């Protein structure tokens, strides 16, 4: 899997591109102003130790140790992106990124006091999403709380050809709002809510379009046409699914007692 991210999706240039659009140090939706708002509710303090699985460039722990001065560990797959992250913290002891399959990493029991994810464990396959999301009920500290958002979408058997075509090529595995929460629920998690906030997600979508039109001669000067056309194309139908559902963003929160 690592290969296969590194050298596609999340090729430097393709992580670059996404950052112009996302905004800096993110490579998830809505990338800052999307992270204050979900964490608006969300309480730590200078002794919480927070997991962030997928921080990819790393602008989640930095938002975190920022507000809350919490301890930080952010994991990602793709070498690439954590050597980039890396680059863009110094002499913080209470950040820390490191390269790593989260599916074989071992961290200690009641460990975190929040397990934090952005649009991460779309990659996973059914059959892994279940087994992180045990892994994560025991990594929780009794009193810790789980949070996510990921991409969801429809029931398959209402998926276009369009549709198809881009879950394939990505090698999503993208269930609905009501099966994620399930998974949450079988393993064991208290007070399972969940949001679908697809208008939520088609509103960020559209402010990251208008940006990316608006800064369209810097972007030409950074990459290529060919690059902002497929930018440009790739928002166009996330925006045209989110509004009718095709696409869902969901939001899940979730605690060990």
């Given at each position: ?88 913290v110094s002499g913080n002891n209470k950040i ?162």
């Amino acid at each position: 899997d690592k290969t296969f991210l590194e050298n596609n999706q999340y090729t430097d240039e393709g992580v670059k591109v996404y950052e112009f659009i996302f905004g800096e140090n993110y490579i998830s939706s809505g990338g800052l102003e999307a992270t204050k708002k979900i964490l608006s509710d969300i309480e730590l303090n200078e002794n919480s130790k927070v997991l962030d699985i997928g921080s990819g460039l790393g602008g989640g722990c930095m938002y975190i140790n920022e507000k809350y001065g919490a301890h930080t560990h952010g994991i990602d797959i793709c070498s690439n992106i954590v050597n980039m992250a890396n680059e863009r913290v110094s002499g913080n002891n209470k950040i820390i990124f490191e390269a790593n399959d989260i599916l074989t990493k071992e961290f200690p029991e009641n460990n975190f006091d929040l397990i934090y994810s952005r649009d991460a464990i779309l990659h996973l396959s059914l059959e892994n999403k279940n087994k992180l999301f045990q892994k994560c009920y025991k990594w929780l500290k009794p009193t810790g709380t789980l949070l996510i958002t990921d991409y969801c979408a429809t029931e398959k058997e209402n998926w276009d050809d369009e549709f198809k075509e881009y879950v394939k090529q990505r090698k999503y595995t993208l269930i609905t709002v009501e099966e994620y929460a399930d998974i949450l629920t079988a393993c064991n998690f208290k007070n399972v809510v969940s949001k679908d906030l697809s208008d939520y997600w088609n509103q960020l979508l559209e402010v990251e379009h208008k940006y990316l039109h608006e800064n369209k001669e810097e972007f030409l000067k950074l990459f290529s046409e060919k690059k902002f056309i497929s930018l440009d194309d790739g928002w166009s139908r996330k925006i045209k699914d989110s509004k009718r559902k095709m696409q869902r963003w969901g939001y899940f929160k979730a605690t060990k007692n």
